Each structure stands twice: as C-alpha cells, then as structure tokens.
Design a protein around this nucleic acid. Sequence first.
RNA 1: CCUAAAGAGUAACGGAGGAGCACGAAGGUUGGCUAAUCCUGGUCGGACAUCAGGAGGUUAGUGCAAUGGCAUAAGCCAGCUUGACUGCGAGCGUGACGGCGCGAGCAGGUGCGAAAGCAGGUCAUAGUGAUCCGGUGGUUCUGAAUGGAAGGGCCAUCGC
RNA 2: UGCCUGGCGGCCGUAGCGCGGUGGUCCCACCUGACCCCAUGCCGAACUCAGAAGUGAAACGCCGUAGCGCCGAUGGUAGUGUGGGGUCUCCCCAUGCGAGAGUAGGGAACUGCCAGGCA
Lengths: 135, 177, 51, 78, 116
Amino acid sequence: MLQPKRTKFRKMHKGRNRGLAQGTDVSFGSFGLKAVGRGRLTARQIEAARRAMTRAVKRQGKIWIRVFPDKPITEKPLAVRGKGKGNVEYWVALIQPGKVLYEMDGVPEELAREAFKLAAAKLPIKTTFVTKTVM
Amino acid sequence: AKLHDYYKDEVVKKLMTEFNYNSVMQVPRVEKITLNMGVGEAIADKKLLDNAAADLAAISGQKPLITKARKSVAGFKIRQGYPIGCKVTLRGERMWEFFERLITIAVPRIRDFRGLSAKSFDGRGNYSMGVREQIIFPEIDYDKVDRVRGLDITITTTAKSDEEGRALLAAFDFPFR
Amino acid sequence: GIREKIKLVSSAGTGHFYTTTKNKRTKPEKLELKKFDPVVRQHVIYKEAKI
Amino acid sequence: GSTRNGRDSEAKRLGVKRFGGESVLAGSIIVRQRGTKFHAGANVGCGRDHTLFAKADGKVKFEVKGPKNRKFISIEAE
Amino acid sequence: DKKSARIRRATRARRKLQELGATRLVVHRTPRHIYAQVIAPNGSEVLVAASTVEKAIAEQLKYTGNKDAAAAVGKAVAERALEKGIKDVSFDRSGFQYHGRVQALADAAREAGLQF
RNA sequence: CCUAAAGAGUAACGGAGGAGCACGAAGGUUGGCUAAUCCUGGUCGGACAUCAGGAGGUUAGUGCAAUGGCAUAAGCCAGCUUGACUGCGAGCGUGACGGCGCGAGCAGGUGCGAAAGCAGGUCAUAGUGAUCCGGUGGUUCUGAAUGGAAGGGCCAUCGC
RNA sequence: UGCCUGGCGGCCGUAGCGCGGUGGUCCCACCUGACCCCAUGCCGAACUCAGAAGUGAAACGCCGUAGCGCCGAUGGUAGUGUGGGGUCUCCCCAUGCGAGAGUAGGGAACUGCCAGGCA
Ligand SMILES: [K+]
Ligand SMILES: [K+]
Ligand SMILES: [Mg+2]
Ligand SMILES: [Mg+2]
Ligand SMILES: [Mg+2]
Ligand SMILES: [Mg+2]
Ligand SMILES: [Mg+2]
Ligand SMILES: [Mg+2]
Ligand SMILES: [Mg+2]
Ligand SMILES: [Mg+2]
Ligand SMILES: [Mg+2]
Ligand SMILES: [Mg+2]
C-alpha cells in the first residue's frame, strides 16, 4: 500500500478539495484513466484498482500510477469522547476533476478499455477512459 | 639563487619554442612549494607535533604554521580547533634553496629509491610527492631523531595542463621514471 | 543558576557600588573594572566584593 | 489519552506602524520587525531590536535599492 | 581579485559618510600614481582634485608613486580646497590602509589647513 | 512556528518545539578576513584528519528552540579596552491596569580610531515574580521638652 | 569637439556567465627589488615600501555572437469583492478586479561629475 516513507509532520489539517486537477494529460503511456469526479482515493483503493488492472492485461505492457496517497487521515477510537487529534489510520490522495489516475502502454486499446473498466469498479470516483493526444 | 638564474637564462627559451608561446609571461613559473606534516597521532601527546615542527623548521629553515582541525570528526577522535599537523610555504629565495637541496641531495638518499612517479598531477599542473623519512635531508641526523616521520611536498605552478607542468620540472632535471 | 551576585565597590571610598554576576568556578580571580563613580564624578577602579 | 501540545507565546504586535506617505514626528516607530526585513534609509534609524524609527519629521517612503532588491524605508524631510 | 576585495573594504565607511552627509576627501592609490578628490555630499559632484598624472605637479617630482609625491598631492588638493573655501571634510581611505603614502597625503592635507 | 481568512489581534484537553540560562568576553572599538559540499593529486592516512588546485556561491556559521535576519556581514581572526557608564530624554510602540518595549538628542566623565565616527551590553524575540515584612551600605531628610541617639524616610542593593 | 583610460555617483541581471576577436604612447594590471616604514598565528602570497628592465599572458576594459541565465507580451485559465442562483463537502450567473505557469518575442545595457592621454 502506497504511503510516504517519511514526513515532516504526522498529522494534517482536514483542508478542502476545491479546483480542477493538474496532470490532466496522458504523459507517460498511451491510455489513461481520468477522474471526472472529486474525492479522496485511499491507498487501499489505489492498490485494489491496480491489481485488477494488472491482472486484466496479464502483466503485459506497462502501468503508471500518477496519484500518490500523501495525506494522512486520523480517526478517533470507538467509545471515545477533544483530548487531542486522533491517530493516523490511513492515507489518501485528493482527487479533482481531470486528474489522470493511471496510465497504460503496450497493449491494444480494446484490452486497455477492459482493464480500466475493471479498475474503475474499485474506485469511489467517476472515471473516464482517455488517450494520448499529439498536442 | 642557483636554480632561479638557471630558470630565467635557460628554461625560459626552451619552453618558448616547445609549446610555442607568444609572450614571456605566458611561460609557467614555480609559484610556491608547500610542505605538510599531517601528524594525526599528536592528539594524545602534543610534544610529538612540537618535535615534528622542530624537524620541519630545520628542513625548510623557516618557522612552521601549526594547522588546526577544520571540523570535528568522530572516526579519528578529533574536535574542531585541535592541532593536527603543520605546513610551511616557500616563496622567492628559500623556495629555490630548498628546491636545490631536494633534487640533488635529498631525493637520491631515499631508502630503496627507484625513481619518483610522473603520474602525480592534479590536472592544473601542480606536482605532489610523499617523502617517507625526514632524515634524507642533510640538516636532520640519524641518531638525533627520536621517531621517524615522513612529510608531503606540493609544488604549485602557474600552469594550465599536466604536460606543461612536467615539462617545467623536466627542465630542472627532476628525477622521473 | 550557578553565577553568583557580586558587588564592585568604588576605590574612591565613596561607598558607591555596581552589582553584577560572576561564574566563581571558572573565573576565581577578582573582577576589576574602571567604572564611573557618580559621587566623585570620575572613572575610578572598581573592585569585587561580597554581595 | 492526552496531548503534549497546548503551548504558544503572546503575539508581539510586529509589523508596519506607518505606511507610505504618512507624516511622522522624529522618534516615531515606522516598523517593528525581527531582523531587517526593511533596512534604514535616509533619516531612519535602526534600533537594537531592528525597529526602524524616524530621526526627522517628514513623510515615510518605501523604496527598493541595490542588486539584491532590498527594501529601504526613508523619511522625506517635508 | 584585488580591486573587488578593496571595494568591499571601502563600503562600510563610504555608506557611513553618505549617511552623515559629509564632504569626502577620496584618495586613490596605484603603484605609480596617487590621486585625490574632494567630492560633494550628494556624491555626484567633484569640487577640487589633484594627482601625480597632472603635469603641473608631476614635473616637480622625482617619482610619482612614493611618499614624497603623496605629500605634494596632499598639499595641492588642500590649497585648492581652501581656495574655494571648504575646510571641513572627512577623509576616505577608500579601502587602503591609512599608512605610508595615504597617511602622507592625509598628513600634508591637514598641515595645509583642511580640518580632519 | 502553524491554525490565523496577505495590517494588528484571534479559540479548542488543536498541530509541533523550546525556556526557568550563558558570557569580563561570547561586551566595546579599530584593522583585517569569508563558508558548506564535491571532484583531482598527495608519507603513515583508511569513506572521513592535515596540504595543494578547481568547481561551487553561503546549500555554511550564528552560546542554546523556532522564526525573521545577517556579506557594509549580525559569521571568522587579531590589537587596544570597560559605554555591561552616571544624570536625563523629543517622540513613538504595546498593554484594562500593574506594567513592558524602541529612542534621536542633551550634560558629565570614558574607551577604541589618524579622523569621520562608533559604544548606555550581547543578530532579534524566552532565561522570570507584585506588595508587605526584614537585612546591608550610603545620605546637605526626619529626630515626640532640648542636644544626641534609637526608629522612620530617601538612594543603592540583598534574602526566603 | 570626438575617441580611449582612471576615479566618484546615478541606474539593478534586457545590465549576468559563456564563446569568438581585440587594446599597452599615456593610463591600469601583472611585474622588479625589500636593509628599512609596515607585514605573515609560516610565507614580501596578501598588506606595505623603494623602483620601472620586461609584459599585455592572466586580470581589467572594449567590440561581436541567442548558447545559456534572465526579461516577457497578447489571449485563455485559476482565484476573487458585491448581488443573485443550484443538483450546495462543490459550483454556476450578472458585474467589477484578474494571476501563476506557459507561448510569441526579446535580450549580448543606459547615464552625470572630475581628471588625464591622443587626434
Ligand atoms: K570584543
Ligand atoms: K575584540
Ligand atoms: Mg483554505
Ligand atoms: Mg507567535
Ligand atoms: Mg495577521
Ligand atoms: Mg486579514
Ligand atoms: Mg474576538
Ligand atoms: Mg556575540
Ligand atoms: Mg528629642
Ligand atoms: Mg523624649
Ligand atoms: Mg492576461
Ligand atoms: Mg504572467
């Protein structure tokens, strides 16, 4: 599960998630899965979608994960009432509309579409299949 | 004195033709000769460096500068501001007078001598060498020394490349192999 | 809290004094400074004494 | 559980007290600052805590001088 | 480099004199010559000057870059300054040690009647 | 320091760290000086000691957190020193108040500098505690009939 | 008057590095000595003094060259004050303000005082 090796700080303000994404182009591969919705992707979701995607292409071609879960999310234990910020439980990437989540190369488009369809079913955010443009 | 007049009245003309220089100032000059006794065993007993300084004083004929530690190092067990060596810089007359005693007298007297290396150059035409014993020089005696100590010599030159550096030293008949 | 308070007493015999602190372990020798004595209105030697 | 945080210091009310074009009497503090974010120009002094103060009556003027593009404050005698 | 290292040495004092708003006596010194200038507070206006490059002064001298030449230039610049009527100036050694030729120039300018 | 919404201020058992000192030099001044790191060569010497040159340009340093500063250096070295002065202070900042802070300049006397000048501690911001009672020294004040003295005041300073 | 050189300011990278060429009568630099004035926590390297045989090599200055650093539109986009609206964790509309990045493009500086040499 993706996670920063180290961080300056353990805990982060909730913050907000406004705006449109940077990294909206297929930069590395030929085909991309792009976020159309807004939300958070946990490390577990990123991994689950990766596994489905990889299996679907039978470990042929190459897959880039463009998103990294670098935001720590805390939670308070059950039956606790205050008394300080909770403990870090998991990590997320903030997603905005347009963010390319995954790229893939060295497979037919037909297979890429299938793999990304399987991946998209693991994600809480609405996605769309995209292709590399010349400009 | 001897090598200084030897440089001006002979060596100049040789290098003017060899490398085909236009101006006389473009010819390499021996800027300075720097000594070094990296005494790193004087952290326990400081008298070792004092005696080493006295030895270096006789060799050069000039008061040695006690070099200090630049930064603290745990590996060698040294703190910043500890005396761990002594250098001497030679320019003008004392430069040549030492350079005289080096080439002719001292270098042959090295124990099991088989010529000095000609690969010891940095890139900007500045030679370096490692003297193993200090007793090779005439000033120091074999019986008088308590402990044998080596030292380093570096010959700084107004050179650009290595070929120009070795060519300058070769004009003074510097033992090469 | 190692530095002890001391008084520097005027040598002019005015009874005027300054106070300061001093690390008595590191520097056992007595502090001695020319300072302005306002009673005689002159720079005179001031010498350390017990607070 | 408990927290190991919960500490802060009093706010020190730093910053610019008199902006550009303001008329100040000599002595007037122009800026309170930690270190010289602004430097003293003409008719301005720098205190021991790097407070910039007017050494003459006049109008405050901010200006950028030098290669580093340092901010100077000066008093235009008026 | 030597000149840049000297400009560094001169900055503190020059910035200070600018702040005080003093009429400077700026000295410049080379191996062969020594110059002198009385520059106005604003800093972009030379009032008087003197040097060993000037033939009026140079003709009287044995060598231009020695103590004795500096003494002459010091006398020269001071007389021309008192002619215009300046008197009060601040000496600016311009990064050179106040010593030897620079000191010689300065001493001669004082003796002549400049107030510093 | 962040939360703090580009003036100030701004809460929570919000997120992170520090203090309860040090220094007669680590203060003053004059003169000078400029870092880290890596590459190349070199006795013992090694990944790293000291020497030389080059690149680099402050990525160092700053007595101790962090932030803001610092080359005219506020960083580093040396000489001479006691301005870590006394009486004051236009004006200003910041506090409900008690208070806390910055300060040109004036008088006296000083140090450094040829001089212009600079110096009323320290790159700055923590290192602390009111009042009462009491102690010590000083004093052109007071002194219960009067002269003294005790005691009180005032100035300096100390204690738990 | 013009050219070149020095000094002191005004102007802060369109003014900086690099690359190519170029200057020594004066000026400047290196350079020549050092017993001295003065100087090295060693060293006449630097500082300093006494000099003018040599040299424009290095440094410094001047001219060319987009190769970099750097500068930089227009348009669009982001954000946003006020008013209004929605499917309200986020947006949209009216109106005003309008970046950053990037793109075209540029860039190889400009200017006063004094002095000196030369024509
Ligand atoms: K000091
Ligand atoms: K000192
Ligand atoms: Mg926000
Ligand atoms: Mg704060
Ligand atoms: Mg604020
Ligand atoms: Mg605000
Ligand atoms: Mg409120
Ligand atoms: Mg200090
Ligand atoms: Mg009585
Ligand atoms: Mg009675
Ligand atoms: Mg626009
Ligand atoms: Mg723009």
